[PDB]
Amino acid sequence: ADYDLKFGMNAGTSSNEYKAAEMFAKEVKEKSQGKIEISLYPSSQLGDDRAMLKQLKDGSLDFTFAESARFQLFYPEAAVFALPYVISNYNVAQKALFDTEFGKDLIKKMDKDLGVTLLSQAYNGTRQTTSNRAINSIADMKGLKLRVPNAATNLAYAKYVGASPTPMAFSEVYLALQTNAVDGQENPLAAVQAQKFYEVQKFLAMTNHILNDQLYLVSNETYKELPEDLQKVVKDAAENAAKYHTKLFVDGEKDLVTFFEKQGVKITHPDLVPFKESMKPYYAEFVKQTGQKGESALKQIEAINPHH
Numbered sequence: 593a594d595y596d597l598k599f600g601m602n603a604g605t606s607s608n609e610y611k612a613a614e615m616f617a618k619e620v621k622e623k624s625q626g627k628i629e630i631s632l633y634p635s636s637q638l639g640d641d642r643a644m645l646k647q648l649k650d651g652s653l654d655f656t657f658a659e660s661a662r663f664q665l666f667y668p669e670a671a672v673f674a675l676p677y678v679i680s681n682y683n684v685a686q687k688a689l690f691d692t693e694f695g696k697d698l699i700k701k702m703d704k705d706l707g708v709t710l711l712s713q714a715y716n717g718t719r720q721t722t723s724n725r726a727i728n729s730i731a732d733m734k735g736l737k738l739r740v741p742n743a744a745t746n747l748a749y750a751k752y753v754g755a756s757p758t759p760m761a762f763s764e765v766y767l768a769l770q771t772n773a774v775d776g777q778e779n780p781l782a783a784v785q786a787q788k789f790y791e792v793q794k795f796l797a798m799t800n801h802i803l804n805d806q807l808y809l810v811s812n813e814t815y816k817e818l819p820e821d822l823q824k825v826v827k828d829a830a831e832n833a834a835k836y837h838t839k840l841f842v843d844g845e846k847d848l849v850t851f852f853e854k855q856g857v858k859i860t861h862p863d864l865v866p867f868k869e870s871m872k873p874y875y876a877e878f879v880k881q882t883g884q885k886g887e888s889a890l891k892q893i894e895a896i897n898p899h900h
């Protein structure tokens with residue numbers, strides 16, 4: 593009521609992201625004694641993630657989600673977070689961001705250059721590929737009309753495996769799939785469930801190509817105005833919500849394959865060696881474009897042990 597704040601997201605009301613944001617909103621309201629109320633704006637009501645990041649910068653939106661990789665729009669080396677097959681697991685994603693020089697620098701720059709404060713990081717699933725025909729091997733990708741988000745790294749995944757990428761906003765995907773304007777898409781299993789893409793896709797291939805994190809971000813214009821006791825409430829609530837957010841994704845990844853099979857989806861397990869070898873020229877291109885900053889980030893990440 594004193595602070596009527598807004599949290600925008602691309603995800604919808606059935607999603608894990610929305611569930612975690614609800615938990616965050618409820619904890620902030622309770623622990624602030626009602627001084628802060630957070631309203632949720634799902635389903636790209638305020639724009640996509642690129643638009644909502646701009647709104648955080650300007651101070652017209654208070655909170656939003658982004659992947660670490662999405663900062664490639666400003667810092668090309670940050671694409672390293674979404675180079676296909678580079679980041680093996682969430683353990684690596686966490687250490688890449690918080691425990692490398694490159695990641696620490698990125699967090700500083702988001703605050704200083706972009707006016708956003710990183711509150712917490714969660715896991716947001718590993719992307720897989722759905723389609724209207726079976727993907728039994730890399731050969732089946734050739735010429736497949738694959739929807740991707742408006743992001744360079746996803747476009748590259750599609751191009752380098754031989755598909756024909758079609759960029760479009762998340763909100764447009766169900767209808768594109770329903771009408772077969774595209775042949776498939778790619779997203780974590782949880783998003784396939786939340787958006788009901790299983791109603792309009794018969795096949796799911798475990799391509800395991802890009803791992804997504806999720807950052808809880810606040811606008812500096814809003815965070816700086818909170819008394820420090822309320823800043824702590826927001827920070828602590830974001831870290832609690834991120835743990836819950838991660839749990840939701842980890843649990844679903846165990847169970848969701850079975851759910852899809854019961855819904856009539858056929859699951860394939862193509863040999864991933866040719867998918868990985870197909871990305872080698874893209875890694876080369878990334879280093880050529882981003883120079884020593886990129887080569888260095890890639891080496892810092894490749895050094896991380898994936899085992900807990």
Ligand SMILES: CC(=O)N[C@H]1[C@H]([C@H](O)[C@H](O)CO)O[C@](O)(C(=O)O)C[C@@H]1O
Binds near residue numbers: 658741779
């Ligand atoms: C934080 C956020 O908005 N994530 C969104 C991502 C990123 O926009 C994309 O991976 C580029 O970073 O795209 C989706 O997976 C998608 O459109 O399929 C929806 C998801 O909600």
Ligand SMILES: [Cl-]
Binds near residue numbers: 732736
């Ligand atoms: Cl083909």
Ligand SMILES: [Cl-]
Binds near residue numbers: 790792793855856857
């Ligand atoms: Cl189906």
Ligand SMILES: [Cs+]
Binds near residue numbers: 724769770772793
């Ligand atoms: Cs279809």
Ligand SMILES: [Cs+]
Binds near residue numbers: 816818820
């Ligand atoms: Cs303050």
